Design a protein around this ligand. Structure first.
Ligand SMILES: [Zn+2]
Length: 409
């Protein structure tokens, strides 16, 4: 039935830096799905196929690297999520013009919703198609403004989600931002003094594919990269022009494949064109991902930007605002450089935006919500959907106001 029947989730615990490199390269050459990188003090998670389980733990054993079996068959966890999301969708009063926060919405429902918003709120909302995905799907975003992007004195705040299609919890967060800026405006300063760009579904082809098929897919759906298309798709968070190809995979079978060149994919190209059009006054750029409970910045390569101190300061302000309203079960937000906290990475969206436009640019890593069955992962429990949105919006508005208050530059 599933391509995940027999797949197991492992937790790798590394003691030193020597092992961080060891485990990292091994995972890459075996082309494993690395959910989170291993580092001393915070063990990582990796999805290992049934036909590679013996080879995988064989290497760790002879290398002296601790590991241990979290989930023997991820299929059971996938089937539960379907069961939990299916029941939430049945009880939901969600409609075409009003998407609720009690279920996960598909690409089609988000696409229709955006268009309905521009009919009911034409003075502040403007729906625009930034382009077409590889498989031809229409990728549209919102431009929220009371001055119709006409007053160039107002700063712009860009926000996006679903770049990695399997990170489903990112969509609620960006959808909540639309809800508070359009539907339920309780804070007039955020709409009057700031112009907003929101892109809900940055990877429509992958997102649709994760809905009926490969749940754990993250790349886009680009073909023509291998004979008979045995392997396909490009990691869009490695396809951006900031130091492209320096810290990513060269194999199309890898989940971190950078592509032919920088902005070779249509999904990343459309984002580039949006950034370019508004680079003259873009104050803040946010690439919302899942999973980690961290706010990162920098440049994936380790080198820090000139305004590093300012970047970290605003990051801490956004983190503290989220931690003040968090779930007791969940942990506090981490702040820092991308290279320092996780691992070397290039071609990232937030890095490029920083280089061509926003003085302040972060990559959000939303919390992995735990429950009775699963722990940390990409699966969504319908009870965290609203909290995921509300929690993040606390950090976003604090950041938007703080970043906008950098009109002293
Ligand atoms: Zn991601």
């Amino acid at each position: 039935h599933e391509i995940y029947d027999g797949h197991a989730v492992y937790q790798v615990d590394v003691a030193s830096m020597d092992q961080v490199k060891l485990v990292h390269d091994f995972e890459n050459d075996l082309m494993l799905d690395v959910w989170s990188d291993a580092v001393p003090g915070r063990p990582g998670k990796v999805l290992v196929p049934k036909f590679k389980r013996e080879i995988f733990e064989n290497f760790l054993k002879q290398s002296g690297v601790q590991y241990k079996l979290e989930v023997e068959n991820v299929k059971e966890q996938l089937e539960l999520e379907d069961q939990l999301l299916a029941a939430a969708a049945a009880k939901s009063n969600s409609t075409r013009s009003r998407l609720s926060f009690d279920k996960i919405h598909s690409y089609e429902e988000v696409d229709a919703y955006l268009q309905e918003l521009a009919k009911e709120f034409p003075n502040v909302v403007t729906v625009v198609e930034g382009g077409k995905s590889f498989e031809g799907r229409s990728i549209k975003y919102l431009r929220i403004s009371t001055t119709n992007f006409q007053d160039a004195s107002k700063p712009v705040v860009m926000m996006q989600s679903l770049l990695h299609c399997r990170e489903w919890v990112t969509l609620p967060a960006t959808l909540y931002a639309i809800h508070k800026l359009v539907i339920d405006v309780t804070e007039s300063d955020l709409i009057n003094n700031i112009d907003w760009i929101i892109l809900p579904v940055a990877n429509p082809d992958g997102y649709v594919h994760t809905f009926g098929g490969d749940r754990y897919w993250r790349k886009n759906r680009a073909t023509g990269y291998m004979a008979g298309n045995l392997c396909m798709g490009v990691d869009l968070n490695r396809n951006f022009g900031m130091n492209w190809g320096t810290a990513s995979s060269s194999s199309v079978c890898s989940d971190t494949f950078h592509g032919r060149s920088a902005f070779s994919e249509p999904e990343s190209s459309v984002i580039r064109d949006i950034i370019a059009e508004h680079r003259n006054r873009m104050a803040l750029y946010l690439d919302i991902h899942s999973f980690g409970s961290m706010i990162l910045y920098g440049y994936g390569n380790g080198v820090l930007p000139s305004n590093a101190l300012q970047l970290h300061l605003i990051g801490v302000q956004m983190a503290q605002a989220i931690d003040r309203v968090k779930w007791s079960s969940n942990k506090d937000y981490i702040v820092g450089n991308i290279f320092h906290v996780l691992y070397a990475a290039s071609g990232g969206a937030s890095d490029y935006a920083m280089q061509a436009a926003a003085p302040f640019s972060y990559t959000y890593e939303l919390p992995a919500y735990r429950n009775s069955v699963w722990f940390d992962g990409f699966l969504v429990d319908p009870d965290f959907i609203e909290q995921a949105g509300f929690e993040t919006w606390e950090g976003i508005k604090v950041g938007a106001r703080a970043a906008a208050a950098a009109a002293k530059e």
